[PDB]
Design a binder for this molecule. Structure first.
Ligand SMILES: Cc1cc2nc3c(=O)[nH]c(=O)nc-3n(C[C@H](O)[C@H](O)[C@H](O)COP(=O)(O)OP(=O)(O)OC[C@H]3O[C@@H](n4cnc5c(N)ncnc54)[C@H](O)[C@@H]3O)c2cc1C
Ligand SMILES: Cc1cc2nc3c(=O)[nH]c(=O)nc-3n(C[C@H](O)[C@H](O)[C@H](O)COP(=O)(O)OP(=O)(O)OC[C@H]3O[C@@H](n4cnc5c(N)ncnc54)[C@H](O)[C@@H]3O)c2cc1C
Ligand SMILES: NC(=O)c1ccc[n+]([C@@H]2O[C@H](COP(=O)([O-])OP(=O)(O)OC[C@H]3O[C@@H](n4cnc5c(N)ncnc54)[C@H](O)[C@@H]3O)[C@@H](O)[C@H]2O)c1
Lengths: 274, 271
């Protein structure tokens, strides 16, 4: 897709890493199809992942009782956010596709990437309470996670010691990415990369590249639409009574998080359905 | 005389999180606990893993791998001293309380980093000893979490979805993986809209709970003995155990749902 912009966020310190190789592969593949490609190599930027007062360069509303959510929003609108935050915000605004490339660390994102989310995804910019989930600011955009693990895929199967990978991805894909409005595409999961032989590693790279050629035409993952819920305080943001009645006699729930005490649809967070 | 470690991840001394830390310390000292703190913001704790975490000679600096190198450094004792100081607090401690606000459906970056730099292989886990067999099986941990959203938003029918799913990666994947018995989480919902008189009752309730915290029953995780713990079997549930669960309506846990119903409040209440 020529005219389209991609942001690649990388969270690995080493240029010798397979994560770095997957980043470079993606950039190459995408440029070849005529994408503009911007990067946030968080280690190379020495990105500061800790929220603090110093994120606001102007005057605090209330420095005696500092609240990061309230103050960060004011700073966004009056335009006195720390410039490092703003630079990242501009990359996001510009971008149509966001690829996150990172190793799984303690069942989640690396601290440096977690911090990126905390400092960059500010209220009013990346979400409001009016516009949550499918109605959020980034509904035009598509995001994908590309994850490498130490553990093997068997360990993350339904019968694996670690348990279902779908549950592990839910807080990131739903609670961070979709909450801001992103359409989330199937994750690229690269299991036990340390114990994958060299010829296979090369096929994985070739497979990533091949996938990115038609990435924009992919169907996204299923999350419950916001229209299934009463979006106000008096109703408690609960699923509507009509929708609850329509789901009563279904065997499967809507998603991992909206399991509703029933079975979770197979690979809700890993494969799309039409 | 038992020992408690309180890990706090909030920058502000005016915060309810700070108030809950102080409450816990007070309550616990009164019952004759020794109480150590890791106030991560106040310590200016460095949450980013890097080469600088190893003060000695790298095995292989051309192809640096944090897991392999960090373990060597632990064994030969050339870990950065800030890591080691935290490691000593953990070793000493019987009860570990994590006090933090929920940020983006998870722990703050600074606390996540603490886990990454402090929970090193051989110290906090092996491979031989995962989950209930892990090094910290003598210890108990509890999460104490504040949210902006209300508990309804995190119910089965809430816009955000089941809180049990949100806690699973932390309680199972981090805490229990290293061996901790995990106690029922202390969840303080919609703290932003709770007036001062109520906040004080919440603090009094926390304090009251901590008087008998050690006698509490922990959360249920699938025992490791249900699995074949070796590489050739792929760490899968044993065939006999799979056959015995076939007919059950409910799964074992949030992560081990097995395509069936999740036991109610698996990550929030003990059986
Ligand atoms: C703090 C921490 C916590 C962790 N927690 C977890 C956890 O909870 N769960 C889990 O499953 N894992 C966990 N891990 C493991 C982690 O996910 C893996 O180390 C990571 O995914 C490996 O990716 P890498 O890119 O760093 O691998 P590397 O070891 O850097 O790369 C793997 C192999 O690919 C080779 N390679 C490099 N470039 C190329 C190329 N261009 N072509 C071909 N081969 C190439 C390398 O030389 C090497 O042989 C954790 C690790 C850390 C540090
Ligand atoms: C980056 C980021 C991401 C977030 N993501 C999420 C998310 O995913 N989900 C979610 O639900 N929320 C989220 N939030 C909101 C966040 O969880 C809340 O703002 C937080 O839990 C508030 O708790 P606090 O301790 O900071 O309270 P504060 O607002 O700082 O404190 C509450 C009040 O209690 C008062 N107080 C202190 N001590 C006492 C005392 N002893 N007696 C009486 N009153 C006292 C204080 O003065 C203050 O006025 C996020 C916030 C941030 C910054
Ligand atoms: N960052 C996030 O991802 C995220 C997500 C969800 C919520 N939040 C936070 O939640 C805030 C708002 O939610 P909250 O839980 O703090 O508000 P709340 O539910 O405590 O307040 C609701 C309002 O209605 C009143 N009210 C109380 N009981 C009621 C009842 N039974 N029926 C009707 N009205 C009642 C309250 O006094 C208050 O004025 C947001 O502004 C934000 O700070 C953040």
């Amino acid at each position: 897709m020529v005219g389209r912009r991609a942001l690649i966020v990388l969270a690995h310190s080493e240029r010798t890493s397979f994560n770095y190789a997957m980043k470079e592969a993606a950039a190459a593949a995408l440029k070849k199809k005529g994408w503009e490609v911007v990067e946030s190599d968080l280690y190379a930027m020495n990105f500061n992942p800790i929220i603090s007062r110093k994120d606001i360069t102007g005057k605090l509303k209330d420095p005696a009782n500092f609240q990061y959510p309230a103050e960060s929003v004011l700073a966004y609108k009056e335009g006195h956010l720390s410039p490092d935050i703003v630079a990242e915000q501009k990359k996001l605004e510009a971008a149509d596709l966001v690829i996150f490339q990172f190793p799984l660390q303690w069942f989640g994102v690396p601290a440096i990437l977690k911090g990126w989310f905390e400092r960059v995804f500010i209220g009013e910019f990346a979400y409001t309470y009016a516009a949550m989930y499918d109605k959020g600011p980034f509904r035009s955009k598509k995001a994908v996670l590309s994850i490498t693990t130490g553990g093997s895929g068997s360990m993350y199967s339904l019968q694996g010691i670690h348990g279902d990978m779908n549950v592990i991805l839910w807080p990131i894909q739903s609670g961070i990415l979709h909450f801001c409005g992103f359409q989330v595409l199937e994750p690229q999961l690269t299991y036990s990369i340390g114990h994958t032989p060299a010829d296979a590693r090369i096929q994985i790279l070739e497979g990533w590249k091949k996938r990115l050629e038609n990435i924009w035409d992919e169907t996204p993952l299923y999350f419950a639409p916001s229209s299934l819920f009463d979006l106000n305080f008096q109703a408690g943001f609960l699923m509507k009574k009509e929708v609850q009645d329509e789901e009563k006699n279904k065997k499967f729930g809507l998603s991992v998080g909206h399991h509703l005490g029933k079975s979770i649809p197979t690979d809700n967070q890993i494969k799309a359905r039409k």
